[PDB]
């Protein structure tokens, strides 16, 4: 029953508390491996990674191979990644999707890893392993688009961002990236490809004001330059103004006005 209590707290997130009971449970030799994979996660959420590594390993030296779950391998990898053992963590992420083939998000985990390390082709390859003609997780398309973008495949980053929008209409983050993806295709701003997206970004963002400070400033900056190029002092100054209204000390907008 006691173990069932700890699982109660844990299923409820009381890591430090669940930890207290698991610790006595072990001290009184409870013959069960399932206190270890749970304590491991508790420690992991409390960022005690050395403690969580020892626990997930004690777990695997005691659990019955046919009982182990996809989740256990997942946390083994999350714990290893935190301890700097990247190759081992990557294998554990792979193992987890091998155990539960619906955990396509593991490939997303492996891709993000290489994305943060600059191997966009590898990151993209694995991020695409999640794509099915059913896929609905926006993030999948958001992170994939970013991989494409930094891999300089702006056209594909755009389509992938169009997908984020399709799934979550008017989401600012989608307009921001469509904007960026299009600005990349129009380096010298000869066509204003990004213009409409940044305009929509301000559309859905102006309202939360300071909450979208960085996005609004970026959007207005593009516009202000677009209009300076097109010799429209009137509009360009207005954009330069929207920025100061958000940041009175902004040096770019100050100098663009004097």
Identify the residue whose tokens are 């991989």: 147
CA–CA distance, 115 with 123 (Å, rounded to integer): 5
Q: Which residue has the tokens 């190759």?
A: 87
Quote the tokens at residue 130. Answer: 């999640």
C-alpha distances in Å from residue 59, one per residue of 7, 44, 55, 64, 68: 15, 14, 6, 10, 9
Tally Cβ neighbours within 10 Å of residue 34.
17
- Integer CA distances (angstroms), 129 to 29, 62, 137, 140, 251, in order: 43, 32, 13, 10, 44
Token pair 């960085």: residue? 214
Report resolution in angstroms: 2.3
Neighbours of 65 (CB within 10 A): 6
Domain ranges for the chain, please list them: 1-258
Q: Six-digit token pair at 42? A: 């508790």
- Whether the CB-CB separation of 238 and 205 falls below 8 Å is answered with no
> Which residue has tokens 């420690």?
43
Q: Residue 213: CB partners within 8 Å, gap ≥ 6?
A: 246, 247
**Integer Cα distance of 55 and 116 in angstroms:** 28
Give the integer Cα–Cα distance in Å for 113 and 102.
20
**HEC string for the chain:** CHHHHHHHHHCCCCHHHHHHHHHHHHHCCCCCCCCHHHHHHHHHHCCCHHHHHHHHHHHHCCCCCCCCCHHHHHHHHHHHHHCCCHHHHHHHHHHHHHHCCCCCHHHHHHHHHHHHCCCHHHHHHHHHHHCCCCCCCHHHHHHHHHHHHHCCCHHHHHHHHHHHHHHCCCCHHHHHHHHHHHHHHCCCCCCCCCHHHHHHHHHHHHHHHHHHHHHHHHHHHHHHHHHHHCCCHHHHHHHHHHHHHHCCCCHHHHHHHC
Please tell us whether the domain made up of 1-258 is placed in CATH 3.40.50.300: no
Using alpha carbons, select from 229, 230, 154 the residue that is nearest to residue 197.
154
Question: Is 16:46 a contact under the CB 8 Å cutoff?
Answer: yes
Q: How many CA atoms lie within 13 A of 202 on its CB side?
A: 18
């Amino acid at each position: 029953v006691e173990f069932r209590y700890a699982d109660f707290l844990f299923k409820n997130n009381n890591y430090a508390e669940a930890i207290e009971v698991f610790n006595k449970l072990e001290a009184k030799k409870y013959n069960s491996p399932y206190i270890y994979n749970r304590r491991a996660v508790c420690y992991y959420e409390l960022a005690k990674y050395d403690l969580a590594q020892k626990d997930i390993e004690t777990y695997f030296s005691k659990v019955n191979a046919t009982k182990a779950k996809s989740a256990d391998f997942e946390y083994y990898g999350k714990i290893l990644m935190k301890k700097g053992q990247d190759s081992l963590a990557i294998q554990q992420y792979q193992a987890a999707v091998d155990r539960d083939t619906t955990r396509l998000d593991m490939y997303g985990q492996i891709g993000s890893y290489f994305y943060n390390k600059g191997n966009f082709p590898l990151a993209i390859q694995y991020m695409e392993k999640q794509i099915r003609p059913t896929t609905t997780d926006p993030k999948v398309f958001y992170e994939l688009g970013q991989a494409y973008y930094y891999n300089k495949e702006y056209v594909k980053a755009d389509s992938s961002f169009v997908k984020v929008l399709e799934l979550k209409p008017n989401i600012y983050i989608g307009y921001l990236w469509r904007a960026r993806a299009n600005a990349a295709q129009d380096p010298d701003t000869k066509q204003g490809l990004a213009k409409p997206y940044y305009e929509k970004l301000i559309e859905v963002c102006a309202p939360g004001g300071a909450k979208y400070k960085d996005e609004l400033i970026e959007a207005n900056e593009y516009i202000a330059y677009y209009y300076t190029i097109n010799r429209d002092k009137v509009k360009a100054d207005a954009a330069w103004k929207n920025i100061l209204a958000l940041d009175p000390t902004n040096k770019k907008a100050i100098d663009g006005l004097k």
